[PDB]
Ligand binder design. Structure first.
Ligand code: B0I
Ligand code: B0I
Ligand code: B0I
Ligand code: B0I
Ligand code: B0I
Ligand code: B0I
Lengths: 14, 14, 14, 14, 14, 14
């Protein structure tokens, strides 16, 4: 995946 | 993660 | 992945 | 995860 | 991601 | 993601 999941992944340096 | 990458993930069922 | 990343993933349901 | 999913992730620059 | 890695992901339910 | 899954990811090269 969702937009929310993607934002979290991006913030965690995926 | 980008919105583009998340869309690709959803398209692949990830 | 790191413990920090996995916790972020866990919080987002990844 | 499937080989298809792994290929899709690499195609998206994960 | 490699087939080995994807196989490991399936083994762990990721 | 679980701690077990995160350990498995690291074992597989993450
Ligand atoms: C869509 C998704 C779900 C779980 C984990 C991930 C992931 C894993 C490692 C690196 C990155 C950038 C994303 C994606
Ligand atoms: C969160 C994320 C970042 C980069 C790539 C992907 C992705 C794209 C296509 C397929 C899969 C399994 C994952 C997700
Ligand atoms: C979908 C998702 C949400 C938050 C964090 C992650 C993530 C980030 C870096 C590495 C890994 C394995 C997972 C994914
Ligand atoms: C099935 C799947 C779910 C989440 C993430 C991935 C993946 C695959 C290859 C590379 C990356 C960064 C993430 C696959
Ligand atoms: C797509 C991918 C790449 C490297 C490692 C893994 C993996 C292996 C075991 C468990 C988990 C959650 C992920 C997947
Ligand atoms: C928490 C998680 C779920 C699915 C896939 C992964 C993953 C993908 C690519 C690389 C790594 C290190 C982990 C993580």
């Amino acid at each position: 995946x969702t937009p929310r999941q993607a934002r979290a992944a991006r913030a965690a340096x995926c």
